[PDB]
Coordinates of C-alpha atoms and ligand atoms in Angstrom, one line a residue:
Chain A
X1 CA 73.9 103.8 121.2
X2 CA 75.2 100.3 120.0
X3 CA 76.9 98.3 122.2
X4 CA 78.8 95.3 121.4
X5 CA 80.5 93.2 124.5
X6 CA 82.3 90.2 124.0
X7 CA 83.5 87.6 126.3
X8 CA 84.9 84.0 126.3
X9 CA 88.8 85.2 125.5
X10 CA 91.2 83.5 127.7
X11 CA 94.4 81.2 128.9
X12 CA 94.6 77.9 127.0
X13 CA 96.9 75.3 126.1
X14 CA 97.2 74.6 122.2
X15 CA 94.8 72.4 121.2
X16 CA 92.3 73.8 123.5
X17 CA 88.9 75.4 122.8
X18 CA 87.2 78.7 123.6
X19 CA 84.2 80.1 122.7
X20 CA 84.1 83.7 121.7
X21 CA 80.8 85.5 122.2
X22 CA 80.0 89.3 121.2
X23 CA 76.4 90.6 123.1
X24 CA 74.7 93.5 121.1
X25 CA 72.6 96.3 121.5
X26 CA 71.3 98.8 119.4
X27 CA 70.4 96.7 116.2
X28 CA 69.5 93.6 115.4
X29 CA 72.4 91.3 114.4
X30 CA 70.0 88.8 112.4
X31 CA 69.8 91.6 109.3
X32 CA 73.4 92.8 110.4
X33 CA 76.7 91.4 108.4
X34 CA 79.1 90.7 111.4
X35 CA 82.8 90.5 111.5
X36 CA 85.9 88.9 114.0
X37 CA 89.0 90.2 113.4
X38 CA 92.1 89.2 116.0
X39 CA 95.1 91.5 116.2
X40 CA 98.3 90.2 117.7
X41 CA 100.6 92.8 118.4
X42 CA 103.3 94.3 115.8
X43 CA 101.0 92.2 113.4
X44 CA 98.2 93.8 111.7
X45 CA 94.2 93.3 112.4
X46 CA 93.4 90.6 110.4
X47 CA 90.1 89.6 109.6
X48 CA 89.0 85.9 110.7
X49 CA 85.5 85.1 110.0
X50 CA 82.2 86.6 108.9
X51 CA 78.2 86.2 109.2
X52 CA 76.7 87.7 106.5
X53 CA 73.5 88.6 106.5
X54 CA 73.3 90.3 103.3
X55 CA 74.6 86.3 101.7
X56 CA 71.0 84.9 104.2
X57 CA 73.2 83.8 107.3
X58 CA 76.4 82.1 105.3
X59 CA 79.8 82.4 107.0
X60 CA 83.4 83.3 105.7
X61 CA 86.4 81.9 106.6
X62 CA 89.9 83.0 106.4
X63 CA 92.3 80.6 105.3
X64 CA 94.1 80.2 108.7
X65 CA 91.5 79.7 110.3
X66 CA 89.0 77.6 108.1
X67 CA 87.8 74.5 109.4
X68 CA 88.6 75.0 113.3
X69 CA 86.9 78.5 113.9
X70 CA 82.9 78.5 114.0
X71 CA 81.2 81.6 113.2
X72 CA 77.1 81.3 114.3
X73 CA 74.5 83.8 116.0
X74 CA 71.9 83.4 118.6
X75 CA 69.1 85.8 116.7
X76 CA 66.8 85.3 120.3
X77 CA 70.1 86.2 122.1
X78 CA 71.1 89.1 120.0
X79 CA 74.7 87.6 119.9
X80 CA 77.1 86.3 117.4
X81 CA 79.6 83.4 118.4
X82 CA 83.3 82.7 117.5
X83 CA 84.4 78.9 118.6
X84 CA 87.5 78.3 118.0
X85 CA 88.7 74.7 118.1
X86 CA 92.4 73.4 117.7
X87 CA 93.9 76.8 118.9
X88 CA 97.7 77.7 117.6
X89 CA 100.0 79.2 119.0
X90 CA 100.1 82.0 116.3
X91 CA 96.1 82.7 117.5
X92 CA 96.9 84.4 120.4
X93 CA 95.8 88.0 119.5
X94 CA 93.1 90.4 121.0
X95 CA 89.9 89.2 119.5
X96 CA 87.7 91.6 117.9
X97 CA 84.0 92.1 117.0
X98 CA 82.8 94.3 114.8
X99 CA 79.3 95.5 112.8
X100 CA 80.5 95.6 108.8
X101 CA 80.7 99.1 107.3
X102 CA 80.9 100.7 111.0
X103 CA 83.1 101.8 113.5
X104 CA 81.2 99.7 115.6
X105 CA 83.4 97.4 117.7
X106 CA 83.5 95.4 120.5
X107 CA 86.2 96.4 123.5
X108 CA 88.2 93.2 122.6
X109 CA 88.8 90.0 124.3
X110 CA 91.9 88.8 124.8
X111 CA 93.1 84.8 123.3
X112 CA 96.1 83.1 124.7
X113 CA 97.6 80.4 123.2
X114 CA 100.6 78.8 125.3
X115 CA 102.4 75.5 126.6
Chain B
X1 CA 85.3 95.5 71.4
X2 CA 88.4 96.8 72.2
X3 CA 90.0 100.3 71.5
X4 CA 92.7 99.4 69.4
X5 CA 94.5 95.9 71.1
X6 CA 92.4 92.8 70.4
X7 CA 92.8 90.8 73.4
X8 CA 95.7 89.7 75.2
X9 CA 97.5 86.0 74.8
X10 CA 99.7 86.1 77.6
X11 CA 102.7 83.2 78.2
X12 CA 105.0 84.6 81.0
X13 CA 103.4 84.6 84.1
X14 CA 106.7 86.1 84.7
X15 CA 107.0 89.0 82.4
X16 CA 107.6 92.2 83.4
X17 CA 105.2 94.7 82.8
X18 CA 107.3 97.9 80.5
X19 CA 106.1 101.5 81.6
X20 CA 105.0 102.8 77.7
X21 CA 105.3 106.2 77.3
X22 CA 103.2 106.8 74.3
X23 CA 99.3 107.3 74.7
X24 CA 98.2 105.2 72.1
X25 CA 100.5 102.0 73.6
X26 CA 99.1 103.0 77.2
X27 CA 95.5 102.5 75.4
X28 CA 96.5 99.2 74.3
X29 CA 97.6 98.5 77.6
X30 CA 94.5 99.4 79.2
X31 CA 92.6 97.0 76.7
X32 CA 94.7 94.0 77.4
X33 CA 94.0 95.0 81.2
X34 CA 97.6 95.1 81.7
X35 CA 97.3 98.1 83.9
X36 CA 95.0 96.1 86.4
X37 CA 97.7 93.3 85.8
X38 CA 99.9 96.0 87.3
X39 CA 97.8 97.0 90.2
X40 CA 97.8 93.3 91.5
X41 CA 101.4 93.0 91.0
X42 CA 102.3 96.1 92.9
X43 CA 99.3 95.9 95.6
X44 CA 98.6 92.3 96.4
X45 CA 101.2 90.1 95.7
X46 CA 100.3 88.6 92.5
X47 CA 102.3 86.8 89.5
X48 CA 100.8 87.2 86.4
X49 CA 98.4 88.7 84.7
X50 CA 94.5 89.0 84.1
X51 CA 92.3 89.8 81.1
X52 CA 93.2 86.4 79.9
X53 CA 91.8 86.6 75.7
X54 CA 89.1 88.7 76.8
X55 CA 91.0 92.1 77.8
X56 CA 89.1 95.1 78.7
X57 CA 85.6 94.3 76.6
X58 CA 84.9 91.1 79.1
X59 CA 85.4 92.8 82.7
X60 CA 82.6 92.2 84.9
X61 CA 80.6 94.9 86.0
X62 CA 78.4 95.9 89.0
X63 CA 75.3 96.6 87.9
X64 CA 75.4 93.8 84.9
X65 CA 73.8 96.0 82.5
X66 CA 76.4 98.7 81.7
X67 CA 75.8 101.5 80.0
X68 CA 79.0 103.3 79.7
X69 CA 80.5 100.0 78.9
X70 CA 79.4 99.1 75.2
X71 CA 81.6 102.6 74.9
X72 CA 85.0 101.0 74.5
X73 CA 86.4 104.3 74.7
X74 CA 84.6 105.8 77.8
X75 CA 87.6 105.5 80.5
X76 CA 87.0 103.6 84.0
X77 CA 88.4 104.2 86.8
X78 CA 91.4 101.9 86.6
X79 CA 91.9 103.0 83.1
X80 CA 92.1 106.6 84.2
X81 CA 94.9 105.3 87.1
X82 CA 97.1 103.7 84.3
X83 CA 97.4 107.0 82.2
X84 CA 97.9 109.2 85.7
X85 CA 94.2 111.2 85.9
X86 CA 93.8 109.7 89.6
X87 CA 94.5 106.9 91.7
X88 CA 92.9 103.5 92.5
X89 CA 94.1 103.4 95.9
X90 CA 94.8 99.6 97.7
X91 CA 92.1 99.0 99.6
X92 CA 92.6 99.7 103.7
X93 CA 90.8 97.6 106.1
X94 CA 88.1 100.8 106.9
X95 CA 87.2 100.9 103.0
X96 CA 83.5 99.6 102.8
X97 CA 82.8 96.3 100.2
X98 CA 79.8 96.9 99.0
X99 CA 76.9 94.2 98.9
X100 CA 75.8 93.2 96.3
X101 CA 78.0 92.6 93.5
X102 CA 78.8 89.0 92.7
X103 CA 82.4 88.8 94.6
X104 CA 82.8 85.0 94.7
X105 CA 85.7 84.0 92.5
X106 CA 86.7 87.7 91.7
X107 CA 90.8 89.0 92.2
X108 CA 90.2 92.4 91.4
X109 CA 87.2 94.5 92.0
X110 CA 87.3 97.9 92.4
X111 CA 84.6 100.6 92.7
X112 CA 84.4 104.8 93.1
X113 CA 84.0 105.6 97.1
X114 CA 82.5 109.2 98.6
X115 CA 86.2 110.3 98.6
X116 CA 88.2 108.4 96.0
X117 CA 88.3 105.2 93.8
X118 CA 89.3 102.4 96.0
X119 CA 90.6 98.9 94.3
X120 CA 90.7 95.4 96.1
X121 CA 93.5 92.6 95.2
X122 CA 94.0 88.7 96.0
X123 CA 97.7 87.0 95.8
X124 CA 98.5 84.4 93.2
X125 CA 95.9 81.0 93.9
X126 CA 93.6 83.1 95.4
X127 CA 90.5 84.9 94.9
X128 CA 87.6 86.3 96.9
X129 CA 84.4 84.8 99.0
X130 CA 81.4 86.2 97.9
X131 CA 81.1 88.4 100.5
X132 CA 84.2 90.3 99.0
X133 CA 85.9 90.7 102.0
X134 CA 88.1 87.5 102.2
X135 CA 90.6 85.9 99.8
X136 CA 91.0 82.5 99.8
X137 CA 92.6 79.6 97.9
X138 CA 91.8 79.2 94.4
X139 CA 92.7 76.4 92.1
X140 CA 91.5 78.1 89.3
X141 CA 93.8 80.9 89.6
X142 CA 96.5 79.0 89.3
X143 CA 97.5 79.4 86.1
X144 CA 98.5 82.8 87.0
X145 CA 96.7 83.7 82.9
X146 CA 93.2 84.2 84.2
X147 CA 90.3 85.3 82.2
X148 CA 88.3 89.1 82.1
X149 CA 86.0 87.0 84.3
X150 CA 88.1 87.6 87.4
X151 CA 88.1 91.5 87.1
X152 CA 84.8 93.7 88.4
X153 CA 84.1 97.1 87.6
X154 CA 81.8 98.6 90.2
X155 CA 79.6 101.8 88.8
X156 CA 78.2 103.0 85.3
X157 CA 81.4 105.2 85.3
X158 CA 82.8 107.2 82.9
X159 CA 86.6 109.3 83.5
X160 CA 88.0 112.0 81.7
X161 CA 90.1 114.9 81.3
X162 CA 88.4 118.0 84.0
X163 CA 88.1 121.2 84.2
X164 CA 89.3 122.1 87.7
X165 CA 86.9 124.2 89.5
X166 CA 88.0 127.1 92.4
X167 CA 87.3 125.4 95.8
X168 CA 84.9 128.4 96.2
X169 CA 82.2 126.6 93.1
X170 CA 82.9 123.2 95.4
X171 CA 81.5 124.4 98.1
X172 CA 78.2 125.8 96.9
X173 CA 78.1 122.2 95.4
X174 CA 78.9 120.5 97.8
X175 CA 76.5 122.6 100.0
X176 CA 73.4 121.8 97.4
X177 CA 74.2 118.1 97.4
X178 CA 73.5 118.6 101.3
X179 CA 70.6 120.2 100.8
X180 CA 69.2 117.2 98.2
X181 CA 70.1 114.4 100.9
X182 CA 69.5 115.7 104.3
X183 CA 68.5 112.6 105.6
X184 CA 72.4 111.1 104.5
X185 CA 74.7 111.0 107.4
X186 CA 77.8 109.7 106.1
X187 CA 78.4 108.0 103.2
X188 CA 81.9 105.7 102.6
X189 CA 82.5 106.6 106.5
X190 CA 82.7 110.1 105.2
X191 CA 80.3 112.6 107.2
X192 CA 77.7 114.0 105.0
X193 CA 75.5 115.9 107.2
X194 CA 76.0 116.6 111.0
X195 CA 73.7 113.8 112.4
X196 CA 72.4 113.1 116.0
X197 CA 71.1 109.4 115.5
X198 CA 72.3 107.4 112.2
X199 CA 71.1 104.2 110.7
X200 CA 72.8 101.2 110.3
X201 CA 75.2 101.7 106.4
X202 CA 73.1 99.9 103.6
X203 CA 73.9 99.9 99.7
X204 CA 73.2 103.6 97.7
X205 CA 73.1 103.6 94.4
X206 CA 73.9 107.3 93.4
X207 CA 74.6 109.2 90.7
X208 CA 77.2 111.7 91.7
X209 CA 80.1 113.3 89.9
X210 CA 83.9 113.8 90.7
X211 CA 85.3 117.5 90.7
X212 CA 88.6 117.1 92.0
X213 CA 88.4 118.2 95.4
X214 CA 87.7 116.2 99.0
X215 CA 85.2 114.1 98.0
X216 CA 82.8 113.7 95.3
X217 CA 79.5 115.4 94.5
X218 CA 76.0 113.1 94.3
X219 CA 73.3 114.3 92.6
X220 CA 69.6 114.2 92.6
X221 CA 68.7 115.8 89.2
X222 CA 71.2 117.0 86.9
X223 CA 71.5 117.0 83.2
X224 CA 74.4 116.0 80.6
X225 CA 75.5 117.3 77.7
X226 CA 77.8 114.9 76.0
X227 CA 79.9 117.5 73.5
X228 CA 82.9 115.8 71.0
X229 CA 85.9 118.4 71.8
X230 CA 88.3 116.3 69.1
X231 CA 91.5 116.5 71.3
X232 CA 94.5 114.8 71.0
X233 CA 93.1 112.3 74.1
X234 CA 90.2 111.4 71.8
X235 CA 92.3 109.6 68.9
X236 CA 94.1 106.6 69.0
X237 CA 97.1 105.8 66.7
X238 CA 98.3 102.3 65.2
X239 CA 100.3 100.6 62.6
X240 CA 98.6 98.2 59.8
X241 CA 99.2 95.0 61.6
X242 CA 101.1 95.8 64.4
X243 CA 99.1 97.7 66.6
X244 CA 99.2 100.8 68.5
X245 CA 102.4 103.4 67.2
X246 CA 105.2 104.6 69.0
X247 CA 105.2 107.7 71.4
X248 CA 107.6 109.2 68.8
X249 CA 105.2 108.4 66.0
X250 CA 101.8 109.5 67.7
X251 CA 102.9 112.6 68.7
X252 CA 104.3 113.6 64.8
X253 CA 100.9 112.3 64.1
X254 CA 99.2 114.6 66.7
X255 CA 101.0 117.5 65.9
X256 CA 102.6 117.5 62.5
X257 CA 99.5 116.7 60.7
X258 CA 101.8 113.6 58.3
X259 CA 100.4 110.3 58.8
X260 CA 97.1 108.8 57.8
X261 CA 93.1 109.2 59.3
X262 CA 90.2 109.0 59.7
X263 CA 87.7 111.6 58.5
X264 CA 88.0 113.6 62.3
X265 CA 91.2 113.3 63.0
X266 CA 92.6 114.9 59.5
X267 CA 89.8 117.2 60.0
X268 CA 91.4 118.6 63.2
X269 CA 95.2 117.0 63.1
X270 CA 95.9 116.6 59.2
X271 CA 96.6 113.9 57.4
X272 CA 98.8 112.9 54.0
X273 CA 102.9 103.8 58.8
X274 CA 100.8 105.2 61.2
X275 CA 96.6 105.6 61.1
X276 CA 94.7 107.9 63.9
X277 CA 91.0 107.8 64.3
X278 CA 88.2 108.6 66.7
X279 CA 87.8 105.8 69.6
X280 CA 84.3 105.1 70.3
X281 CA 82.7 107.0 73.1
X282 CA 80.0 109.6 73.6
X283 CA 82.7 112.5 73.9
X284 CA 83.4 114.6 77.2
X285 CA 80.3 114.8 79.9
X286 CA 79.3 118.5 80.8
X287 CA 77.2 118.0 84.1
X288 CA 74.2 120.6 84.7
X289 CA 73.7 120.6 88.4
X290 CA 73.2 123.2 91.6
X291 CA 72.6 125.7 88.7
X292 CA 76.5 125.5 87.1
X293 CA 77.9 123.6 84.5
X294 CA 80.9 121.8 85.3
X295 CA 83.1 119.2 83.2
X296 CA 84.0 116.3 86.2
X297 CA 87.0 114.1 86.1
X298 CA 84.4 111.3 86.3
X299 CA 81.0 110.8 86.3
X300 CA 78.9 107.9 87.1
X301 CA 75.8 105.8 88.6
X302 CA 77.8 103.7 91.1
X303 CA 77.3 101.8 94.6
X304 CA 78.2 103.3 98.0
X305 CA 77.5 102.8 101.3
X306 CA 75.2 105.2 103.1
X307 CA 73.8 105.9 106.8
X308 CA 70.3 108.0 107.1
X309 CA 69.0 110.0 110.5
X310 CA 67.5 108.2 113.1
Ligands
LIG401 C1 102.9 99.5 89.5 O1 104.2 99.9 89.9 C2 105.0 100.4 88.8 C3 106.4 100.6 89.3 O2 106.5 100.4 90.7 C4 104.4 101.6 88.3 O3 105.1 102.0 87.1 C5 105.7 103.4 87.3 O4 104.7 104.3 86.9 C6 105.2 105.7 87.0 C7 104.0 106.5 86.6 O5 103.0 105.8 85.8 C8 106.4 105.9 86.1 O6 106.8 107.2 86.3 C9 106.9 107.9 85.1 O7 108.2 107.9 84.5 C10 108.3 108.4 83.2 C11 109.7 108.1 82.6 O8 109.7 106.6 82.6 C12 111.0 106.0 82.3 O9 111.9 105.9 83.3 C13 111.7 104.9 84.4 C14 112.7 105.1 85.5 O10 113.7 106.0 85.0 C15 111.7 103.4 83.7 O11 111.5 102.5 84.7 C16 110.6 103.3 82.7 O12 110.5 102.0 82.1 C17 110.6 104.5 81.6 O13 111.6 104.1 80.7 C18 107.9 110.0 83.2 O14 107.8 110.5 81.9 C19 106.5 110.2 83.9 O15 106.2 111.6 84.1 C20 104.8 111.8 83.9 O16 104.1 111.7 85.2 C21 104.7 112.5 86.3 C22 103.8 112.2 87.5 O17 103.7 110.8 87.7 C23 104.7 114.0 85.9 O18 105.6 114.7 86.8 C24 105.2 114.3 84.4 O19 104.9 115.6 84.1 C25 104.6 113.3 83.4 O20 103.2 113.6 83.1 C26 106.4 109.4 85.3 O21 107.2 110.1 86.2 C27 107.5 104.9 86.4 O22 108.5 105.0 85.4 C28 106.9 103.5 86.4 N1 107.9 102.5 86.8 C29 108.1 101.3 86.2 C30 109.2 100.5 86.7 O23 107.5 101.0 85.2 C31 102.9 101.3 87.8 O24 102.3 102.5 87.4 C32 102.2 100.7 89.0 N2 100.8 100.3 88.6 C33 99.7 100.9 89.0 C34 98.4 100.3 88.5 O25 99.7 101.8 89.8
NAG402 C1 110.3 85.3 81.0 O1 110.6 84.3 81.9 C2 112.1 84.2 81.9 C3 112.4 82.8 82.5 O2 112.8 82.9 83.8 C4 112.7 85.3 82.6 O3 114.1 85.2 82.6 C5 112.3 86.6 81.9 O4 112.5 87.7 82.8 C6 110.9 86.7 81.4 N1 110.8 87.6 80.3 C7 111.2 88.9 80.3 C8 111.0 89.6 79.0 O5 111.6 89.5 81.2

């Protein structure tokens, strides 16, 4: 079985930091292409930021989020990262991990943005 | 080259795109890519057009080296959508990008899936990372006029008019191409064979064929016969000049054996303004496999995603 846990979701006040973390088992996430997607509710899942593999390690970006969310793994750790930095109000969602081409996700941690 | 429309100057990002009736001016729509033009418009938000002075002969394909390409008149996929023979449906967020292909920079790709053809757009000013999977800002697109270089045609594929086969002839096909991949699980996130453990999805390059039912039918050895059936579909018509002939005028052509041709078209149609000739292409595909011969609504060497047992 894979198994992806994630952790790090949370209260914060806009501005504020958290880190995101997904733990797997089952593969190994340094040949796997891994995926966050956050889904806020009415809106749709949206993807936020990849680690691909199959491009050697490079990372992806949405526009939103470019240049304040941090994508990385911990190959030793088996774990892939999501720090977010300079959190909006319209990032509050339920954070997602996922394994690309799979139905492999993560239960979902849950980012709060508010004042 | 091109099958009858040399390549499209375009000046309105704004103009609309007209719904032609005629098969010859949907031909010359399809070579000015004005029916992926379309797609973007309707699908993913997009002013303009693409196939800027390259039309259809300067898509980018995935492999490089195609095959069925240097055959202007073999249809692709999105060629097939524009004249109605299937659909290249908007990507979901579940449909698999497959590695591979050289995404950066691309606003349209599309590619044949396990159970379909599945097409991918960016807005206006953007286009996509190279994983495929994001769009994001472009300067380059800006113009909204942006060259064949933006547009990538996944698979050594070729569409065409089919044969529909009883769902009864599916099966047993569909059963053999079991039988030649046990060790596929699913492929697309379609389930292939029942499979207790299954590896993570990697690229599968695959020749399979389409016959019009659930999903498509990949092959391990089959043969082709490529056979010129000279129908109507296989001739395009055009004025001296002016390019490709009214629907009024191509079908008096087609069926009233008046206007000018070329050696096979007065041959089958007649001939005595308009001009109809023979587009360039093989002909229709008969595929040998499973012990029957079938004649597929496409046919191709294309990229998929694949699990095997664990
Ligand atoms: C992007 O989105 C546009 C519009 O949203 C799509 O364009 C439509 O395409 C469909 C099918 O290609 C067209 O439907 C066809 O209508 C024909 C008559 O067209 C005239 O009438 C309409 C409205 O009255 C005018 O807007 C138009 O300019 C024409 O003057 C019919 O003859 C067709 O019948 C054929 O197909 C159907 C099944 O589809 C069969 O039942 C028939 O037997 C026959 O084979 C067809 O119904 C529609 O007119 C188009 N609309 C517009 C506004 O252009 C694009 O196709 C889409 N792009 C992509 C890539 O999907
Ligand atoms: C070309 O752009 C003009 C300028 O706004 C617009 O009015 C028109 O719709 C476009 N052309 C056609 C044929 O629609």
């Amino acid at each position: 079985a894979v198994q992806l846990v994630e952790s790090g979701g949370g209260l914060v006040q806009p501005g504020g930091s958290l880190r995101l973390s997904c733990a797997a088992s089952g593969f190994t996430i340094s040949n796997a292409d891994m995926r966050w997607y956050r889904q806020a509710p009415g809106k749709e899942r949206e993807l936020v930021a990849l680690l691909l593999s199959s491009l050697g390690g490079s990372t992806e970006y949405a526009d939103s989020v470019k240049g304040r969310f941090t994508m990385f793994r911990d190959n030793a750790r088996n774990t892939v990262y999501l720090q977010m930095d300079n959190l909006k109000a319209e990032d509050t969602a339920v954070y997602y991990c996922n394994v690309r081409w799979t139905d492999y996700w993560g239960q979902g941690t849950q980012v709060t943005v508010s004042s | 080259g091109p099958i009858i429309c040399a390549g499209p100057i375009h000046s309105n990002k704004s103009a609309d795109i007209p719904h032609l009736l005629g098969y010859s001016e949907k031909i010359c729509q399809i070579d000015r890519l004005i029916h992926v033009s379309s797609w973007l418009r309707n699908h993913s938000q997009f002013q303009g057009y693409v196939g800027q002075r390259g039309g259809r002969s300067q898509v980018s394909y995935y492999p490089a080296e195609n095959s069925y390409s240097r055959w202007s008149g073999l249809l692709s996929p999105c060629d097939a959508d524009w004249l109605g023979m299937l659909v290249v449906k908007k990507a979901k967020g579940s449909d698999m990008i497959v590695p591979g292909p050289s995404y950066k920079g691309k606003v349209f790709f599309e590619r044949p899936t396990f159970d379909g053809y599945v097409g991918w757009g960016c807005g206006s000013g953007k286009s996509r990372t190279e994983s495929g999977e994001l769009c994001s800002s472009d300067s380059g697109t800006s113009s909204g006029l942006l060259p064949s270089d933006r547009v990538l045609w996944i698979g050594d594929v070729a569409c065409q008019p089919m044969t529909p086969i009883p769902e009864e002839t599916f099966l047993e096909l569909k059963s053999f191409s079991q039988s030649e991949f046990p060790d596929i699980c699913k492929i697309d996130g379609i389930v292939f064979n029942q499979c207790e453990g299954e590896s993570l999805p990697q690229p599968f390059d695959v020749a399979w064929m389409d016959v019009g039912h659930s999903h498509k039918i990949i092959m391990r050895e089959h043969k082709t016969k490529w056979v010129q059936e000279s129908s109507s579909k296989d001739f395009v018509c055009y004025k001296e000049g002016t390019g490709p002939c009214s629907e009024s005028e191509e079908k008096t052509c087609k069926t009233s054996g008046s206007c000018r041709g070329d050696m096979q078209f007065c041959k089958v149609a007649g001939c005595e303004k308009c001009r109809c000739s023979l587009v360039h292409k093989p002909g229709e595909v008969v595929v040998s496999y499973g012990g029957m011969r079938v004649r597929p609504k496409c046919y191709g060497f294309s990229r998929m995603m694949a699990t095997l047992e664990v």
